[PDB]
């Protein structure tokens, strides 16, 4: 019966766009991702289920939870026994491609993660390091010692 | 059954664009719906890769994963900067 239980994801996706309380919004966000990973499990894409878990509900909705907590908003089959003699796990059959054949679409997401690092740095350094922690930059020979205000 | 796993993703995407249209006031729900529609196209790539029995779908789904994640990173960082001090 778990096949049609994507209705859970369906209603939780309707919640996030029709909720004024942000905690419920992020909760049903996490729920949408959990049910989408359930779906991606039913399809046998095991790697993508765990990747949804990790890089969505252990990183991204962690971000969103932070933005809520702080900064509150207010029969007949014919199985062909060939190609089963060596079953390729999903990771192996993503790595046979992503790193050798379509490797530039993998070095470009490298640049996108690098741009995300540079962006999270230049944006949210928040004047807390050399961006402004250099100095107040007050010099003596350039001052008039307030004798003449 | 592919239609069941696609039209459901299609209407998840429609929910995302709907929340985009309505919530032009609140931005955190805007970003919620952004990652929603970048899932409903991501889960769409995975479903269409299982259906067509083609691996380009999953390669593209992985890259959209690790691109929408950087997009959410920069998005929320921009949102935190927007609520200045």
């Amino acid at each position: 019966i778990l096949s049609v239980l994507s209705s859970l994801a369906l209603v939780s996706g309707l919640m996030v766009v029709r909720a004024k309380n942000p905690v419920h919004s992020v909760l049903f966000f996490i729920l949408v991702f959990c049910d989408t990973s359930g779906l991606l499990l039913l399809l046998g894409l095991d790697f993508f289920a765990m990747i949804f878990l990790v890089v969505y509900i252990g990183a991204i909705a962690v971000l969103f939870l932070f933005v809520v907590m702080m900064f509150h908003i207010q029969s007949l089959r014919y199985t062909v026994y060939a190609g089963k003699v060596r079953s390729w796990t999903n990771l192996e059959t993503l790595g046979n491609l992503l790193y050798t054949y379509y490797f530039v679409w993998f070095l470009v997401p490298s640049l996108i993660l690098l741009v995300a690092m540079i962006g999270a740095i230049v944006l949210t350094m928040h004047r807390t390091t050399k961006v402004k922690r250099q100095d107040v930059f007050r010099r003596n020979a350039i001052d008039f010692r307030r004798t003449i205000m | 059954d592919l239609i069941k796993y696609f039209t459901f993703s299609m209407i998840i995407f429609i929910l995302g664009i709907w929340g985009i249209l309505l919530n032009r006031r609140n931005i955190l729900i805007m970003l919620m719906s952004i990652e929603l529609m970048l899932l409903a196209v991501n889960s769409n790539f995975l479903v269409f890769s299982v259906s067509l029995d083609d691996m380009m779908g999953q390669v593209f789904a992985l890259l959209v994963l690790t691109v929408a994640a950087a997009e959410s990173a920069i998005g929320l960082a921009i949102f935190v900067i927007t609520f200045r001090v």
Binding site: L10, L14, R18 | K4, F8, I11, I14, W18
Partner: peptide, 20 residues
């Protein structure tokens, strides 16, 4: 207001989608 009046619209839409 009709964009907000679409509550029952989209809801019953999802319902008639899950009917199938």
């Amino acid at each position: 207001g009709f964009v907000y009046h679409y509550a029952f619209a989209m809801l019953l839409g999802l319902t008639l989608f899950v009917t199938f």
